[PDB]
Write a protein that binds this DNA or RNA. Sequence first.
RNA 1: CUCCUGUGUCGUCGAACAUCGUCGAACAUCGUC
RNA 2: GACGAUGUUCGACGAUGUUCGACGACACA
Lengths: 928, 187, 186, 73
Amino acid sequence: ADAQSFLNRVCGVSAARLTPCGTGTSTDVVYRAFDIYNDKVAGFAKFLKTNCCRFQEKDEDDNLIDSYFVVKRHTFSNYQHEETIYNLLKDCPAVAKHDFFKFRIDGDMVPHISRQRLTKYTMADLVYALRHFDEGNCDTLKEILVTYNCCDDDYFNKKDWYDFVENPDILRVYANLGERVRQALLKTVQFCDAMRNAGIVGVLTLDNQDLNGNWYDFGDFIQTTPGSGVPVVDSYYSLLMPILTLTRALTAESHVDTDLTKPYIKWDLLKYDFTEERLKLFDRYFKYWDQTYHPNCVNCLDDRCILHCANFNVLFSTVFPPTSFGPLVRKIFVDGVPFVVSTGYHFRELGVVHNQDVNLHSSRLSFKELLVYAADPAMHAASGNLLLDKRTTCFSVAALTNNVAFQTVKPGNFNKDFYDFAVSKGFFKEGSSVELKHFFFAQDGNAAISDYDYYRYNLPTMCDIRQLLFVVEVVDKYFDCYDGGCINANQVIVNNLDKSAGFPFNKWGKARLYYDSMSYEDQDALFAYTKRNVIPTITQMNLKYAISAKNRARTVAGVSICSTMTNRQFHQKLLKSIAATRGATVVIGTSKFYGGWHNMLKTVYSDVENPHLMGWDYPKCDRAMPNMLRIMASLVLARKHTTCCSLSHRFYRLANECAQVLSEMVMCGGSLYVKPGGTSSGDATTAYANSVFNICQAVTANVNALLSTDGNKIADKYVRNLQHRLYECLYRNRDVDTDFVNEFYAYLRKHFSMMILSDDAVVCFNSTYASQGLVASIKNFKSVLYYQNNVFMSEAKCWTETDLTKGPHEFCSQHTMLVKQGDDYVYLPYPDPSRILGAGCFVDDIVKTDGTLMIERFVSLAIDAYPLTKHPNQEYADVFHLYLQYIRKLHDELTGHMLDMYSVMLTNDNTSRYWEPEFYEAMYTPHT
Amino acid sequence: FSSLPSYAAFATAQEAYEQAVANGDSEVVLKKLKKSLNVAKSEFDRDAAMQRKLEKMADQAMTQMYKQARSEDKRAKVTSAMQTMLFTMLRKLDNDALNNIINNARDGCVPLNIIPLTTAAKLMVVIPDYNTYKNTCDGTTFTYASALWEIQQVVDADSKIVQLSEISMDNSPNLAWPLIVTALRAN
Amino acid sequence: FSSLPSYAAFATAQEAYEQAVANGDSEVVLKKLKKSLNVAKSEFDRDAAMQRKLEKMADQAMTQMYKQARSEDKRAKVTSAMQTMLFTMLRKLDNDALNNIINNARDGCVPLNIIPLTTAAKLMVVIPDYNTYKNTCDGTTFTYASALWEIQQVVDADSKIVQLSEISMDNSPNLAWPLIVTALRA
Amino acid sequence: PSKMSDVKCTSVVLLSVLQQLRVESSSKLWAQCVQLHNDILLAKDTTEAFEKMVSLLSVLLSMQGAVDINKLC
RNA sequence: CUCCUGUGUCGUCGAACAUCGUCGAACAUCGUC
RNA sequence: GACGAUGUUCGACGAUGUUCGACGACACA
Ligand SMILES: [Zn+2]
Ligand SMILES: [Zn+2]
């Protein structure tokens, strides 16, 4: 009939066995992902394609394969225009056939365009499926994974198949798309060359490319003089970049002739430069990215150029051998005695950087030269044994000794008198609400290395740079009210001067020895030396002995004294200005006593219209944090040095931060390993880089929530214009638009309020917007973490509170309770009673069991446990009353022991304040 | 405390006041002697308090000088320790393999991660399971890092010497894992 | 505060001042009695503050020594107080397995390895005499840790495997009797 | 109190006693003791925490350090 | 021979400053003889 | 020169408050 004639016309010449998928008219495919930008809409969303009539092709045996004949029905002007633009690009092999024809649909010559043999999905569909991930709505991703033999439905039958921590085989399942994505990139470069040669101008979007690589839809292309065409590939490459490392697109570049069926390239073992290789890779895959790429980020022009080129370097460094990164040693003669010291560094992100003050043939070593030579891992690794540690997958450098060290953790010390007292006061009964859950868990020798091995969660993550270097502007706006810069050595405030000094300096003393041995001139000289040289140091992981509720080990990282000593002078002014500011987003240094909790909460709630509360968590926050976001945090913190440091000084300070905190050599046991990335616990600026990263992820979730909605359905005109300009400032503008950055910052601060501490946040958002999709929800955080953090955030760890009279469900391990405090209603933080009782019953030293020597211990625990006395659950208040009665008993028996052992009274006339709730109650009221 | 000018005035005014109170004269002179006794005792207490201030300044100086004589001691001690450590670890370092791989580089600048990989004369393999041992260090000699190593002194997690014949498939649940194999680069 | 020499001076001064203000004298008398009270009260405050400082320093130095002594006692008596605490609170649990194990181990029937929990794992316990063997074991079943175990083999002190029908009252003195029995959890 | 809190506190005290007897100098034994301790502290059923307490106490009683007739007098 | 960074609170001790009081004692002014 | 009166001046003492420092402890990220 008519449909059969249409089908035979659609086949035409090819031996195409077509079956009418849908019917003989438009098919209206369900919700393909488009990347559109016109005068009305703008965004990367899922729209409703409705002007096509698809036919699926079958081969012999009449079973269906993955090739469709999409037939459009557009007007005559567009028909002739696309025919003219296709008659030029027809010779390109990265272009699907088109076969323009005319067919009498209703009686009058309707013109059709029939692109031939195109895959069910496009590249925009793959990118949207992997970037906006929903663990219960991922049908397109499953179909794409199955259709290309990455896996099979029995894989999705299992649990947590999508998770990156549980089931890390999804990395291999994804990497099975790498060669397909890489062939798509090569076909894109071919198409760009054809466009330039034919003199065609047009914007390349992702939704106009198959999952084979072929291009089509020459609708908005303009013809020009041949040889002077210009493709626009900003949105294409930028939206594509996060999946170039997820699917390991450039794995085939490690092989000989760049094909996976050949051996690896046996790179020269002494080679460390790899700059011509990086330029070749760029010119091969990103040829028409029209912004200068510096392989070595030491030649960059500012911090935005550093972020750009470091993104490209963190992609290209996955091709080169891992033994070619790290310090670049060199033979130095210290008075006719040959040393081996570091005179450079080769970063995976910052390229190659050489020290400027390298002096061969020295005569004598001063104190600061001895420091920089004893802190380098060069002399410690060049002299130690080789090491092949089969317990981990992390790179192992050398073993410093002749044998491995297996460090264990001990159990806690049972305080039996407090426990007997508690169970005499009617505690710890069967089926009670308050029970012991926090203990001192013991560990065996295999705990330190099994906890270091969790760095396997830090994968190379390439970031969408066009949105990362806008999110960085909004974050910098979040950090404007502070005052930072470099300080002299005599202005540095160091507290706890009797702590360890890292490795190897802990063989000779604590930090006091090295702060007293060095005059202020020596410290200033060392600091001014780290601005022209890279000092790679060694951190030391060692297990933590503290009370917790989970039986997993906890390590801490002790960074050297050189690194802390100079990082203090760099950052301490800004860090103190952050910790001494109230009313801001980053609530660091704000106390919870004397009405501080109420003030913080009232500041979060500030002006939001339909306020709900919300809080999330980062799974494996320190292990899985990508290196690009840590470099971004460092640059945002160092943006305060616009007058004290030049550009090269700031770059060398960034290089030092990287080489010392980000990818340094970790000594776990008695052996040196290579840390892939993350955050060092003992870094000077950890609780603040964490806050910058927190705000970065929240702003990213917000731009992903606003750009991924149908702009045709946003009822408000202001928000529609704001989404249009947001897309245009991400992917169509290279410069910084300070007016729109201020406008988006105001929008966020009005509709998405935050209370950020280090990787702990509480948000008071506008619930109507979040339901319409104009601010971030929990699903947007889940998606952003999946594609920008390589973790899966389970919604069982996040929370939401619709009633603001109850505070946050949890913030800084404290719950919130609205109590009446003298005609006023305030918010008070109360802990977990199990935590306070566990701190009472289990101590970490045998002398803390005596009690009478440790009454201030229980005074502090009762200060922390006071607000439980306002709880409607009676056992929660009984906790505080128990602590008070025990303090009284402790004082009584101490007085008895003093009167009997010795023979003198110890009234003290002032110890009766701790038995009564007035002290602790005044601890939670505003001063005056 | 008698080393001050006002102490003599104090003693003299006290003596005059005593000689006056031993007679009991009219109040016009007695009050003036009390005023002189003041001026004396007031300047006396002034200079005595100033003497206490200067003595405390001297004590602060003494403590500040007894602390520097220990800070310099500690500085010299840690300097000696650091450079002794450098010169000691350097003696197990300088050889022909290092001087050979450095002299092959473009400008003498080689990565650090290949210094022990190509110059170290002793390997240490830590092996968690038995299958890892079977696939890694089977036999007395094995190949790693493009070299040929020679097993000697395999020990266990307790640092007790394990014999090569005890590492079997059936005896593996009887010895403490991991085992730390030590090898020597065969020439 | 009443034992210092200034006590009598301050008391007499205050009493005379009250007696004089109760009299209603001229203005010079008020100021002169106030002067007496002034100097007396001032010197009394002086030596009383001296005594307060001395007593506070004494109490501080006494409590520091007390804390030192108690800390040393705690650190010294460890490893001998932890064990008695452990057994004190193990007797209080009053379990039927832990008490059985404790009683056997105090009689001599100590195990040789960790007591297993699986259905077919091996257990080896020492048995020092026949009467200890007489009540813990009948026939083949071996009752230990409040659970039935099935004997596999019994050895002597010199690892000379012995059977089950040979262990008896008359046949007891023909062995050395640290018989290591073996069994699996039934 | 309850028979669970007592068991957890006794397992804490028992592993302390074992650690003082230098069991840390045996990799396998210390690993098993740590496993039993951490499993008693996370237990929910009282009938399994008692089995693991049996196992841990059997680790203690198989040595010859603690004189048992004097402690249990 | 091992225990990191930062924040915040409590306790003890010490120092400096200000105010008030306990005061001791010089006088700078006023009225009178 | 004395009488009376106020206040100014230092030092010791007591207290309060403020701020800094040293040591100990507790909590949090
Ligand atoms: Zn650049
Ligand atoms: Zn600066």
